[PDB]
Amino acid sequence: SHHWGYGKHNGPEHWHKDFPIANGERQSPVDIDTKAVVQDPALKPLALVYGEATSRRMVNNGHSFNVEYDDSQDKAVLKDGPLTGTYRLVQFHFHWGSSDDQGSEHTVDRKKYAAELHLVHWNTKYGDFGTAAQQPDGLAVVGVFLKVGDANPALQKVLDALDSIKTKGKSTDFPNFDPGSLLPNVLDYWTYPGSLTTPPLLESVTWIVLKEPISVSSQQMLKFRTLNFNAEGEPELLMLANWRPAQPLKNRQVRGFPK
Ligand SMILES: NS(=O)(=O)c1ccc(C(=O)NCC(=O)NCCc2c[nH]cn2)cc1
Ligand SMILES: [Cu+2]
Ligand SMILES: [Cu+2]
Numbered sequence: 001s002h003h004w005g006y007g008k009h010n011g012p013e014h015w016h017k018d019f020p021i022a023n024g025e026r027q028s029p030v031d032i033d034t035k036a037v038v039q040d041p042a043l044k045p046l047a048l049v050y051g052e053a054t055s056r057r058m059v060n061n062g063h064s065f066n067v068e069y070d071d072s073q074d075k076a077v078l079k080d081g082p083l084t085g086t087y088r089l090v091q092f093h094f095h096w097g098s099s100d101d102q103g104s105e106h107t108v109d110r111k112k113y114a115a116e117l118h119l120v121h122w123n124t125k126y127g128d129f130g131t132a133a134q135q136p137d138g139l140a141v142v143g144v145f146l147k148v149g150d151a152n153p154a155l156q157k158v159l160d161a162l163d164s165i166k167t168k169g170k171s172t173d174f175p176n177f178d179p180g181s182l183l184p185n186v187l188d189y190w191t192y193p194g195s196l197t198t199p200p201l202l203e204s205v206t207w208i209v210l211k212e213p214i215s216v217s218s219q220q221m222l223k224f225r226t227l228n229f230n231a232e233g234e235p236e237l238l239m240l241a242n243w244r245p246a247q248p249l250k251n252r253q254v255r256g257f258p259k
């Protein structure tokens, strides 16, 4: 079975063979060169309205795990920031690396964090996530860095479930998780127009990368790496790393709020 990943033969450097947009003009992630960041008075503070969020299940999809949210109504939305309109939360997931010194997708002056959380939202003007994913203003992903140092109790609630979804296709019920519990205390951000960081690599994402990381311990990072890319019965392939490296900026502009 041919499907993509982060291995020797199916990894990021190969994705362009199957998804030519991989070498497109607005790919993600990117390195954020802080000396080059532009101040734009049009940018607003982020509004993350997650009080009534309804988490459903946690799923191992064979490339990461998603905590899925009910997006049938305006229950958990993102607005303001760089955005026009309302964007509904559909899921969050993580990327990580094989050791604590690497694993974030975005980098800041070439510095890599241990992991990166992605909160994925879609523009309600399009009716559904799939339709939104094919438009330049269709998606908004909030990225949050995980910085190694101190264990994160809110994150531990997520990690406590991973033993239930060790393998590809496994899912587990995962109710009453507040995705706001994984945000930092300050919501300063960088923003730029980009893409999904995995296949299908669609150039529909307004990226909103928070400046302030949340914590994670080294012990906690071990837990991410216990997942399997493969389905049960197949040869074991540990989910040691699942990050795409920085892609060329190509004269896009990174803006910063409040500077
Ligand atoms: N790493 S990243 O750039 O943040 C990212 C990469 C891929 C996808 C994606 O293709 N994700 C499918 C998905 O989550 N599909 C939702 C299906 C759906 C519709 N309504 C409810 N669920 C989303 C985000
Ligand atoms: Cu795949
Ligand atoms: Cu391939």
Ligand SMILES: [Cu+2]
Pocket: 003, 061, 062, 063
């Ligand atoms: Cu897959």
Ligand SMILES: [Cu+2]
Pocket: 128, 129
């Ligand atoms: Cu849907």
Ligand SMILES: [Zn+2]
Pocket: 093, 094, 095, 118, 197
């Ligand atoms: Zn992601």
